[PDB]
Amino acid sequence: KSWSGELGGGIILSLRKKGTTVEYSIGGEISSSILANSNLVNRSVPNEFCPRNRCSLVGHMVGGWNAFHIDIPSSGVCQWFGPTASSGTPRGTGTYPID
Amino acid sequence: TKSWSGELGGGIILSLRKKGTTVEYSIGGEISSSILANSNLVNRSVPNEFCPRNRCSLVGHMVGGWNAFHIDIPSSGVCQWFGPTASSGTPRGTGTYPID
Amino acid sequence: KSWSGELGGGIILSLRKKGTTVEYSIGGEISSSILANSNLVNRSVPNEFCPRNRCSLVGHMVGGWNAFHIDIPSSGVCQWFGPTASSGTPRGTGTYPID
Amino acid sequence: VQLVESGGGLVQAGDSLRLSCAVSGRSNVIGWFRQAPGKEREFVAAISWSTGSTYYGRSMKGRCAASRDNAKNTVALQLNSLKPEDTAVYYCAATLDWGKTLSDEYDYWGQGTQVTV
Amino acid sequence: VQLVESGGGLVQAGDSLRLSCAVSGRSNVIGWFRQAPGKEREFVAAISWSTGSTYYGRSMKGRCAASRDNAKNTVALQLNSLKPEDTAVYYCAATLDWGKTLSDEYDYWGQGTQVTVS
Amino acid sequence: VQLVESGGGLVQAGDSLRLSCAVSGSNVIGWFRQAPGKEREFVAAISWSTGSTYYGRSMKGRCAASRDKNTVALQLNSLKPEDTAVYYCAATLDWGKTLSDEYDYWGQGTQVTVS
């Protein structure tokens, strides 16, 4: 099972389930202002990709030394843990576990 | 499926879960004391069953800013901080590292 | 299957295939100038480690708060997405999917 | 893959223009980019060919819409509330990947089409 | 998860106070937070209900202790060497996860209990 | 892993010097240099198992590592008084480490003085 969604503020999250492991890819570009420590409310990670424990996905902004993280809690309501931002190209590939 | 958590040093918590030859990790807590750049985190060592064959570099992020760091888990389990000197912040980071 | 190659600019990429998942470790040090958004032309990632979709591998520079990312496209010709750099020790252990 | 941009020309402030991008092959996602002389290239929009999913960049949010006419083998970018600032050459691009916004992440490119506002 | 804080009130500098959290529902870790009016919410301590492991934040290091009793199905937070700075409303919180220190990382919350130090 | 550095002495600008790491008791043998009052630098790494090499920023295009004699050699060419430092040999299971902190076993070193 595969899924893609524009989480909020222009950030896209692409997901692929492989057994107890979810593969992810942070996409898109920050098109509106995203508050520090805010919920990404446009899209929720569907149930089948939701972890038992909160996953902190470390990403990088294209063209600089800037990093951020997006949390995927069990609810699928992702959170942005970078500072308040209104521009940039977020990227980051990896995996996170499920049960 | 063996699990472990321990405060490595400076208030930094490391949670691990072994799944075959892969260890799942989660960086936790908050910096409560000064951690020197390139220093050993001497409060807690990673137990042997979670120690890798090769030095693994776990990339984390500090809450509220653009700051990133990394913590190395050598085969000894004596973790090393590779961010700059820091005395404040909320370190986070989820991922996996291989074992044998 | 394991592989290591100096991609370009002194950056080493170490890879280990485990089913449909590739385990990575960034090594070396920047020995020459690497342009922002440039191709790493010294070594290509071998076919057996090339993903179906473009993978963004996040790393960190030793001693500071600096982060970067290297994308592995299906061709294996890696692209650096940090700013222009000529120094630093790049590190980072993670995974990316083959699929 | 092969890409040809149609439509585009002179128009006034507040007007609308429908750009077309003819595509041949075999890509899954068709991207839209714009570059003004002496300015940074910008991502405008992306549309999946199989599905009809769209994504819009920072540059023309709320004043542009991408669609596909699945035969014709066309993707079209509609621009509204046009202002002389949206004056640039509009490019069409192709990739297997969603949701890419960088020029570097696109494999096949079109000649472009000038849009003067 | 239902959370009710007890204890707390007025005390003097150097004094001690024991706060209680009555927990109902079902295991999580129980966090302790404090917020002074016009000030940043701070993490104080956390405890795992299933293991009993504790973790103490920067705010009250060497000056607080958490504990758990089941039943009473209560979590106690003990504060010592109290100073008028530790004056805030003390909250109890719950999550599945160890070791979270952000207010945003906790799912269930208690009404709180005021602690005034003079 | 036991490490002893051989070779090294005084030489002039543009000259060449071959160093040797006598290894006893690791897969990768690293080469480091430290000038007094200066930052320790990575020079080169060589895999004992395979013959794979890697060269740091410090002496690119003017140094070459080789395998032999439980010996690892470090050829140095186009030497300049700046390459003046004590040259160390190091060992680890890991490729491709460039930090002093990432190496487990170390050698006494050997002084190299140019001009």
Side-chain angles (χ1 to χ4, degrees), chain A, chain B, chain C, chain D residues 3-17 19-27 29-39 41-47 49-60 62-71 74-82 84-110 112-117, chain E residues 1 3-17 19-25 27-39 41-60 62-71 73-82 84-110 112-118, chain F residues 3-17 19-26 28-38 40-46 49-59 61-68 71-79 81-107 109-115:
Chain A
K1 249 186 167 269
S2 289
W3 175 91
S4 250
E6 196 269 276
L7 298 176
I11 310 171
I12 302 173
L13 184 67
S14 284
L15 301 172
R16 185 158 209 123
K17 192 175 157 290
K18 286 219 167 177
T20 58
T21 293
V22 179
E23 297 157 359
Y24 73 86
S25 217
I26 306 164
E29 85 183 354
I30 302 183
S31 62
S32 47
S33 215
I34 307 156
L35 299 173
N37 306 31
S38 74
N39 288 338
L40 297 158
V41 299
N42 187 252
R43 293 273 232 144
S44 270
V45 166
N47 175 79
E48 60 273 31
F49 305 100
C50 292
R52 179 210 276 165
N53 307 291
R54 188 177 261 265
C55 302
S56 307
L57 317 183
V58 181
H60 174 253
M61 305 295 285
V62 170
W65 298 127
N66 297 349
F68 63 88
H69 81 85
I70 292 155
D71 267 21
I72 310 174
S74 62
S75 68
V77 181
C78 306
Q79 277 182 267
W80 165 262
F81 288 104
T84 305
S86 55
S87 62
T89 313
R91 294 291 180 272
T93 299
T95 61
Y96 70 87
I98 230 115
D99 297 310
Chain B
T1 305
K2 264 190 162 259
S3 291
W4 177 87
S5 243
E7 192 233 288
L8 309 172
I12 303 173
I13 316 161
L14 185 64
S15 299
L16 310 161
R17 184 159 101 190
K18 192 178 155 291
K19 285 219 166 178
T21 57
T22 293
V23 181
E24 296 158 359
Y25 73 84
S26 216
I27 305 165
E30 66 188 1
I31 306 172
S32 60
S33 48
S34 214
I35 309 158
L36 294 162
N38 313 11
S39 72
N40 289 336
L41 299 151
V42 299
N43 188 251
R44 225 81 217 77
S45 267
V46 170
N48 176 77
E49 61 272 32
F50 304 100
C51 292
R53 179 211 273 165
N54 311 289
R55 191 171 257 258
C56 294
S57 306
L58 322 180
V59 181
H61 173 254
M62 306 294 288
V63 169
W66 298 124
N67 296 349
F69 63 88
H70 81 86
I71 292 153
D72 275 22
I73 305 178
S75 60
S76 74
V78 180
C79 306
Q80 202 166 345
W81 166 261
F82 287 102
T85 304
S87 54
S88 62
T90 313
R92 294 289 181 270
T94 296
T96 62
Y97 70 88
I99 229 119
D100 300 305
Chain C
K1 253 189 164 269
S2 290
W3 174 90
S4 246
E6 191 234 288
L7 309 173
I11 306 171
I12 305 171
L13 186 61
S14 299
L15 304 168
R16 185 160 101 191
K17 194 177 154 290
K18 286 219 167 178
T20 56
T21 293
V22 179
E23 295 158 358
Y24 78 83
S25 214
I26 301 151
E29 62 183 348
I30 302 173
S31 61
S32 47
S33 216
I34 307 158
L35 293 161
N37 312 12
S38 71
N39 288 341
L40 292 156
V41 300
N42 185 253
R43 251 118 182 105
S44 271
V45 172
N47 174 79
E48 59 274 30
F49 305 98
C50 293
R52 181 209 277 165
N53 313 285
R54 186 172 265 265
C55 295
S56 309
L57 314 189
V58 181
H60 174 255
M61 306 295 283
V62 167
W65 298 124
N66 298 344
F68 64 87
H69 81 85
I70 291 151
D71 283 18
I72 306 172
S74 61
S75 71
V77 180
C78 309
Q79 297 184 268
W80 164 263
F81 287 104
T84 305
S86 314
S87 64
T89 311
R91 295 288 180 275
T93 298
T95 62
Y96 71 88
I98 279 313
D99 47 49
Chain D
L3 256 55
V4 198
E5 284 86 288
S6 3
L10 225 155
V11 89
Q12 261 151 128
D15 289 75
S16 134
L17 196 62
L19 312 171
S20 183
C21 171
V23 186
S24 345
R26 294 66 148 95
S27 79
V29 192
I30 285 87
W32 279 97
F33 289 85
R34 74 167 189 191
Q35 209 199 152
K39 264 201 252 204
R41 194 136 29 129
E42 301 183 305
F43 172 76
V44 182
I47 184 159
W49 196 95
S50 247
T51 87
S53 322
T54 60
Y55 178 68
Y56 305 99
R58 207 180 310 153
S59 71
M60 312 184 77
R63 351 180 308 268
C64 91
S67 70
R68 88 239 136 114
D69 212 5
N70 241 33
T74 322
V75 159
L77 183 77
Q78 155 82 51
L79 318 139
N80 322 302
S81 190
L82 252 0
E85 259 150 86
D86 309 324
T87 311
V89 40
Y90 283 71
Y91 307 94
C92 185
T95 30
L96 208 278
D97 316 324
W98 185 267
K100 305 276 128 116
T101 60
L102 300 182
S103 322
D104 316 71
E105 302 170 317
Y106 288 80
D107 310 303
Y108 311 100
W109 291 80
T113 203
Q114 173 64 217
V115 169
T116 322
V117 196
Chain E
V1 170
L3 255 53
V4 196
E5 298 87 336
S6 3
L10 223 152
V11 89
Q12 258 152 124
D15 288 75
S16 134
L17 195 63
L19 316 171
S20 237
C21 189
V23 186
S24 345
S27 244
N28 292 51
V29 350
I30 286 85
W32 279 99
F33 288 86
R34 72 167 190 192
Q35 209 200 153
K39 264 200 250 209
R41 187 138 56 159
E42 298 182 307
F43 172 75
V44 182
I47 183 160
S48 148
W49 196 283
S50 240
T51 81
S53 319
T54 59
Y55 177 69
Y56 305 100
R58 144 210 319 142
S59 72
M60 311 184 78
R63 304 171 46 241
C64 69
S67 99
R68 182 267 274 113
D69 181 317
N70 43 330
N73 290 348
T74 290
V75 168
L77 183 76
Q78 184 68 253
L79 328 151
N80 321 304
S81 182
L82 252 1
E85 259 150 86
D86 310 322
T87 312
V89 40
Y90 283 71
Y91 307 95
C92 185
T95 29
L96 208 272
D97 316 323
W98 187 267
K100 308 280 123 144
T101 61
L102 302 179
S103 345
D104 317 71
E105 297 170 320
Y106 286 77
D107 312 302
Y108 310 99
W109 290 80
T113 200
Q114 175 63 219
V115 170
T116 320
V117 203
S118 61
Chain F
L3 265 340
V4 200
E5 282 82 303
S6 2
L10 218 146
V11 88
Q12 260 151 126
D15 288 76
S16 132
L17 196 63
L19 312 186
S20 328
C21 203
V23 189
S24 347
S26 78
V28 190
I29 285 86
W31 278 99
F32 289 86
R33 75 168 188 192
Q34 209 199 152
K38 264 201 250 208
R40 187 138 55 159
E41 299 182 307
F42 172 76
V43 182
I46 170 101
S49 238
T50 83
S52 321
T53 62
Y54 176 69
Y55 303 103
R57 199 173 336 151
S58 72
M59 312 185 79
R62 349 181 309 268
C63 91
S66 69
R67 262 197 332 203
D68 199 339
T71 298
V72 166
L74 198 73
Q75 179 67 46
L76 312 158
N77 323 304
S78 191
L79 252 0
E82 259 150 85
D83 309 322
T84 310
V86 40
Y87 284 70
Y88 307 94
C89 185
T92 30
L93 207 279
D94 317 326
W95 186 268
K97 309 281 122 142
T98 60
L99 300 182
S100 344
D101 318 69
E102 298 170 318
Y103 286 78
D104 312 302
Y105 310 100
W106 290 81
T110 201
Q111 174 66 216
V112 166
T113 308
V114 195
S115 185

Coordinates of all heavy atoms in Angstrom, one line a residue, chain D residues 15-73, unseen atoms left out:
Chain D
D15 N -6.1 39.3 -16.6 CA -6.6 38.3 -17.7 C -6.2 36.9 -17.4 O -5.5 36.6 -16.4 CB -6.1 38.8 -19.0 CG -6.9 40.0 -19.5 OD1 -6.6 41.2 -19.1 OD2 -7.7 39.9 -20.4
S16 N -6.6 36.0 -18.3 CA -6.4 34.6 -18.1 C -5.7 34.0 -19.4 O -6.0 34.5 -20.5 CB -7.7 33.8 -17.7 OG -7.9 32.6 -18.5
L17 N -4.9 32.9 -19.2 CA -4.2 32.3 -20.3 C -4.1 30.8 -20.0 O -3.8 30.4 -18.9 CB -2.9 32.9 -20.5 CG -2.2 32.5 -21.8 CD1 -3.0 33.0 -23.1 CD2 -0.8 33.2 -21.9
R18 N -4.5 30.0 -21.0 CA -4.4 28.5 -20.9 C -3.2 28.0 -21.7 O -3.2 28.2 -23.0 CB -5.7 27.9 -21.4 CG -5.9 26.4 -21.1 CD -6.0 25.6 -22.4
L19 N -2.2 27.4 -21.0 CA -1.0 26.9 -21.6 C -1.2 25.4 -21.8 O -1.9 24.8 -20.9 CB 0.2 27.2 -20.8 CG 0.4 28.6 -20.3 CD1 1.5 28.8 -19.4 CD2 0.6 29.6 -21.5
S20 N -0.7 24.9 -22.8 CA -0.8 23.5 -23.2 C 0.6 22.8 -23.2 O 1.5 23.5 -23.5 CB -1.5 23.3 -24.5 OG -1.7 22.0 -24.9
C21 N 0.7 21.6 -22.9 CA 1.9 20.8 -23.0 C 1.6 19.5 -23.6 O 1.0 18.6 -22.9 CB 2.6 20.7 -21.6 SG 4.1 19.6 -21.6
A22 N 2.1 19.3 -24.8 CA 1.9 18.1 -25.6 C 3.0 17.2 -25.2 O 4.2 17.6 -25.0 CB 2.0 18.4 -27.1
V23 N 2.7 15.9 -24.9 CA 3.6 14.9 -24.3 C 3.5 13.6 -25.1 O 2.4 13.1 -25.5 CB 3.3 14.7 -22.8 CG1 4.3 13.7 -22.2 CG2 3.3 16.0 -22.0
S24 N 4.7 13.0 -25.4 CA 4.9 11.8 -26.2 C 5.9 10.9 -25.5 O 6.9 11.3 -25.0 CB 5.3 12.1 -27.6 OG 5.1 13.4 -28.0
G25 N 5.6 9.6 -25.6 CA 6.3 8.5 -25.0 C 5.4 7.3 -24.7 O 4.3 7.3 -25.2
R26 N 5.7 6.5 -23.7 CA 7.0 6.5 -23.0 C 8.1 5.7 -23.8 O 8.0 5.6 -25.0 CB 6.8 5.9 -21.6 CG 5.9 6.7 -20.6 CD 4.4 6.8 -21.1 NE 3.5 6.8 -19.9 CZ 3.0 7.9 -19.4 NH1 3.3 9.1 -20.0 NH2 2.1 7.9 -18.4
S27 N 7.5 8.5 -17.4 CA 7.0 9.6 -16.7 C 5.6 9.3 -16.2 O 4.8 8.6 -16.7 CB 6.9 10.9 -17.6 OG 5.8 10.9 -18.5
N28 N 5.2 10.0 -15.0 CA 3.9 9.8 -14.4 C 3.5 11.2 -14.0 O 2.3 11.5 -14.2 CB 4.0 9.0 -13.2
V29 N 4.4 12.1 -13.6 CA 4.1 13.4 -13.1 C 4.6 14.4 -14.1 O 5.8 14.4 -14.6 CB 4.6 13.7 -11.7 CG1 4.1 15.0 -11.1 CG2 4.3 12.6 -10.7
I30 N 3.8 15.4 -14.5 CA 4.1 16.5 -15.4 C 4.2 17.8 -14.6 O 3.2 18.2 -14.0 CB 3.2 16.5 -16.6 CG1 3.5 15.4 -17.6 CG2 3.3 17.9 -17.4 CD1 2.8 14.0 -17.4
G31 N 5.3 18.3 -14.5 CA 5.6 19.6 -13.8 C 5.6 20.8 -14.6 O 5.8 20.7 -15.9
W32 N 5.3 21.9 -14.0 CA 5.3 23.2 -14.6 C 6.2 24.2 -13.9 O 6.1 24.3 -12.7 CB 3.8 23.8 -14.6 CG 3.0 23.2 -15.8 CD1 2.1 22.2 -15.7 CD2 3.0 23.7 -17.1 NE1 1.6 22.0 -16.9 CE2 2.1 22.9 -17.8 CE3 3.6 24.7 -17.8 CZ2 1.8 23.1 -19.2 CZ3 3.4 24.9 -19.2 CH2 2.5 24.1 -19.8
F33 N 7.1 24.8 -14.7 CA 8.1 25.7 -14.1 C 8.1 27.0 -14.9 O 7.7 27.0 -16.1 CB 9.5 25.1 -14.2 CG 9.8 24.0 -13.3 CD1 9.5 22.7 -13.6 CD2 10.5 24.2 -12.1 CE1 9.8 21.6 -12.7 CE2 10.8 23.2 -11.2 CZ 10.4 21.9 -11.5
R34 N 8.6 28.1 -14.3 CA 8.6 29.4 -14.9 C 9.9 30.2 -14.6 O 10.4 30.1 -13.5 CB 7.4 30.3 -14.6 CG 7.3 30.9 -13.2 CD 6.3 31.9 -13.0 NE 6.4 32.6 -11.7 CZ 5.5 33.4 -11.2 NH1 4.4 33.7 -11.9 NH2 5.7 34.0 -10.0
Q35 N 10.5 30.8 -15.6 CA 11.8 31.6 -15.4 C 11.8 32.9 -16.1 O 11.7 33.0 -17.3 CB 13.0 30.8 -15.8 CG 14.2 31.3 -14.9 CD 15.6 30.9 -15.5 OE1 16.5 31.7 -15.2 NE2 15.7 29.8 -16.2
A36 N 11.8 34.0 -15.3 CA 11.8 35.4 -15.8 C 13.3 35.7 -16.0 O 14.2 35.2 -15.3 CB 11.3 36.3 -14.7
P37 N 13.6 36.5 -17.1 CA 15.0 36.8 -17.4 C 15.6 37.5 -16.2 O 15.0 38.4 -15.6 CB 15.0 37.7 -18.6 CG 13.6 37.4 -19.3 CD 12.7 37.1 -18.1
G38 N 16.8 37.1 -15.8 CA 17.6 37.6 -14.7 C 16.9 37.3 -13.3 O 17.0 38.0 -12.4
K39 N 16.2 36.2 -13.3 CA 15.5 35.7 -12.1 C 15.5 34.2 -11.9 O 15.8 33.5 -12.9 CB 14.0 36.2 -12.1 CG 13.8 37.5 -11.3 CD 12.3 37.7 -10.9 CE 11.6 38.7 -11.7 NZ 10.5 39.3 -11.0
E40 N 15.4 33.8 -10.6 CA 15.4 32.3 -10.2 C 14.2 31.6 -10.8 O 13.1 32.1 -10.8 CB 15.5 32.2 -8.7
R41 N 14.5 30.4 -11.4 CA 13.5 29.5 -11.8 C 12.5 29.1 -10.7 O 13.0 28.8 -9.6 CB 14.1 28.3 -12.4 CG 13.2 27.4 -13.2 CD 13.9 27.0 -14.5 NE 15.3 26.9 -14.4 CZ 16.0 25.8 -14.7 NH1 15.4 24.7 -15.2 NH2 17.3 25.8 -14.5
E42 N 11.2 29.1 -11.0 CA 10.2 28.7 -10.0 C 9.4 27.6 -10.4 O 9.0 27.4 -11.6 CB 9.3 29.9 -9.6 CG 10.1 31.1 -9.1 CD 9.2 32.3 -8.7 OE1 8.4 32.7 -9.6 OE2 9.3 32.7 -7.6
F43 N 9.0 26.7 -9.4 CA 8.1 25.6 -9.6 C 6.7 26.3 -9.6 O 6.4 27.1 -8.8 CB 8.2 24.6 -8.5 CG 7.1 23.5 -8.5 CD1 7.2 22.5 -9.5 CD2 6.1 23.5 -7.6 CE1 6.2 21.5 -9.5 CE2 5.1 22.5 -7.6 CZ 5.1 21.5 -8.5
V44 N 5.8 25.8 -10.5 CA 4.4 26.4 -10.5 C 3.4 25.3 -10.1 O 2.7 25.6 -9.1 CB 4.0 27.1 -11.9 CG1 2.6 27.7 -11.8 CG2 5.0 28.1 -12.3
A45 N 3.4 24.2 -10.8 CA 2.4 23.1 -10.5 C 2.9 21.8 -11.0 O 3.7 21.7 -11.9 CB 1.1 23.5 -11.1
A46 N 2.3 20.7 -10.5 CA 2.6 19.3 -10.8 C 1.3 18.6 -10.9 O 0.4 18.8 -10.0 CB 3.5 18.7 -9.9
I47 N 1.1 17.7 -11.9 CA -0.1 16.9 -12.0 C 0.3 15.4 -12.4 O 1.1 15.3 -13.4 CB -1.1 17.5 -13.0 CG1 -2.4 16.6 -13.1 CG2 -0.6 17.7 -14.4 CD1 -3.7 17.2 -13.5
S48 N -0.2 14.4 -11.8 CA 0.0 13.0 -12.0 C -0.8 12.7 -13.3 O -1.9 13.2 -13.5 CB -0.4 12.2 -10.9
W49 N -0.3 11.8 -14.2 CA -0.9 11.4 -15.4 C -2.0 10.3 -15.1 O -3.1 10.4 -15.6 CB 0.1 11.0 -16.4 CG -0.4 10.9 -17.8 CD1 -0.4 11.9 -18.8 CD2 -1.1 9.8 -18.4 NE1 -1.0 11.5 -19.9 CE2 -1.5 10.2 -19.7 CE3 -1.5 8.5 -18.0 CZ2 -2.1 9.3 -20.6 CZ3 -2.1 7.7 -18.9 CH2 -2.5 8.1 -20.1
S50 N -1.5 9.2 -14.4 CA -2.4 8.1 -14.1 C -3.6 8.5 -13.3 O -4.7 8.4 -13.7 CB -1.6 7.0 -13.3 OG -1.4 5.8 -14.0
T51 N -3.3 9.1 -12.1 CA -4.3 9.7 -11.2 C -4.5 11.1 -11.7 O -3.8 11.5 -12.7 CB -3.8 9.6 -9.7 OG1 -3.0 10.8 -9.3 CG2 -3.1 8.3 -9.4
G52 N -5.3 12.0 -11.1 CA -5.4 13.4 -11.6 C -4.9 14.3 -10.6 O -5.1 15.5 -10.7
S53 N -4.1 13.8 -9.5 CA -3.6 14.6 -8.4 C -2.8 15.8 -8.8 O -2.0 15.7 -9.7 CB -2.8 13.7 -7.4 OG -3.4 12.4 -7.3
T54 N -3.1 16.9 -8.1 CA -2.4 18.1 -8.4 C -1.7 18.6 -7.1 O -2.0 18.2 -6.0 CB -3.4 19.2 -8.9 OG1 -4.3 19.4 -7.9 CG2 -4.0 18.8 -10.2
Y55 N -0.7 19.4 -7.4 CA 0.1 20.1 -6.3 C 0.6 21.4 -6.9 O 1.0 21.5 -8.1 CB 1.3 19.2 -5.9 CG 2.2 20.0 -4.9 CD1 1.7 20.2 -3.6 CD2 3.4 20.4 -5.2 CE1 2.4 21.0 -2.7 CE2 4.2 21.2 -4.3 CZ 3.7 21.4 -3.0 OH 4.4 22.1 -2.1
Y56 N 0.5 22.5 -6.1 CA 0.8 23.8 -6.5 C 1.9 24.4 -5.7 O 1.8 24.4 -4.4 CB -0.5 24.7 -6.6 CG -1.6 24.2 -7.4 CD1 -2.6 23.5 -6.9 CD2 -1.5 24.2 -8.8 CE1 -3.6 22.9 -7.7 CE2 -2.4 23.6 -9.6 CZ -3.5 23.0 -9.1 OH -4.4 22.4 -9.9
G57 N 2.8 25.0 -6.3 CA 3.9 25.7 -5.6 C 3.5 27.0 -5.1 O 2.3 27.5 -5.3
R58 N 4.4 27.7 -4.4 CA 4.4 29.0 -3.8 C 4.1 30.1 -4.8 O 3.2 31.0 -4.5 CB 5.7 29.3 -3.1 CG 5.8 30.2 -1.9 CD 7.2 30.3 -1.4 NE 7.8 29.0 -1.2 CZ 9.2 28.8 -1.3 NH1 10.0 29.8 -1.5 NH2 9.6 27.6 -1.1
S59 N 4.7 30.1 -6.0 CA 4.7 31.1 -7.0 C 3.2 31.6 -7.5 O 3.0 32.8 -7.5 CB 5.5 30.7 -8.2 OG 5.0 29.6 -8.9
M60 N 2.3 30.6 -7.8 CA 1.0 31.0 -8.3 C -0.2 30.3 -7.6 O -1.1 29.7 -8.2 CB 0.9 30.9 -9.8 CG 2.1 31.5 -10.5 SD 1.9 31.5 -12.3 CE 0.7 32.8 -12.6
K61 N -0.2 30.3 -6.2 CA -1.2 29.6 -5.4 C -2.5 30.4 -5.5 O -2.6 31.6 -5.4 CB -0.7 29.5 -3.9
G62 N -3.6 29.7 -5.7 CA -5.0 30.2 -5.8 C -5.3 30.9 -7.1 O -6.4 31.3 -7.3
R63 N -4.3 31.1 -8.0 CA -4.5 31.7 -9.3 C -4.0 30.9 -10.5 O -3.7 31.4 -11.6 CB -3.9 33.2 -9.4 CG -3.5 33.8 -8.1 CD -3.0 35.2 -8.3 NE -2.0 35.3 -9.4 CZ -0.7 35.2 -9.2 NH1 -0.2 35.2 -8.0 NH2 0.1 35.2 -10.2
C64 N -3.8 29.6 -10.3 CA -3.5 28.6 -11.3 C -4.0 27.3 -11.0 O -4.3 26.9 -9.9 CB -1.9 28.6 -11.5 SG -1.1 27.4 -10.5
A65 N -4.3 26.5 -12.1 CA -4.8 25.2 -12.0 C -4.3 24.3 -13.1 O -4.4 24.7 -14.3 CB -6.4 25.2 -12.0
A66 N -3.9 23.1 -12.8 CA -3.4 22.1 -13.8 C -4.5 21.1 -14.0 O -5.2 20.7 -13.0 CB -2.1 21.5 -13.3
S67 N -4.6 20.5 -15.2 CA -5.5 19.5 -15.6 C -5.0 18.7 -16.7 O -4.0 19.1 -17.4 CB -6.9 20.2 -16.0 OG -6.8 20.8 -17.3
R68 N -5.5 17.5 -16.9 CA -5.1 16.7 -18.0 C -6.3 16.4 -18.9 O -7.4 16.2 -18.3 CB -4.4 15.5 -17.6 CG -5.3 14.2 -17.3 CD -5.1 13.7 -15.8 NE -6.4 13.4 -15.2 CZ -6.8 12.2 -14.9 NH1 -6.0 11.2 -15.0 NH2 -8.0 12.0 -14.3
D69 N -6.1 16.4 -20.2 CA -7.1 15.9 -21.2 C -6.3 14.7 -21.6 O -5.3 14.8 -22.3 CB -7.2 16.9 -22.3 CG -8.6 16.9 -23.0 OD1 -9.5 16.2 -22.5 OD2 -8.8 17.6 -24.0
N70 N -6.8 13.5 -21.3 CA -6.0 12.3 -21.4 C -6.0 11.8 -22.8 O -5.4 10.8 -23.1 CB -6.4 11.3 -20.4 CG -5.3 10.9 -19.4 OD1 -4.5 11.7 -19.1 ND2 -5.3 9.6 -19.0
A71 N -6.5 12.6 -23.7 CA -6.4 12.4 -25.1 C -7.3 13.4 -25.6 O -8.5 13.2 -25.4 CB -6.9 11.0 -25.4
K72 N -6.8 14.4 -26.2 CA -5.4 14.7 -26.5 C -4.4 14.2 -25.4 O -4.7 14.1 -24.2 CB -5.2 16.2 -26.7
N73 N -3.1 13.9 -25.8 CA -2.1 13.5 -24.8 C -1.6 14.8 -24.2 O -0.4 15.2 -24.4 CB -1.0 12.8 -25.5

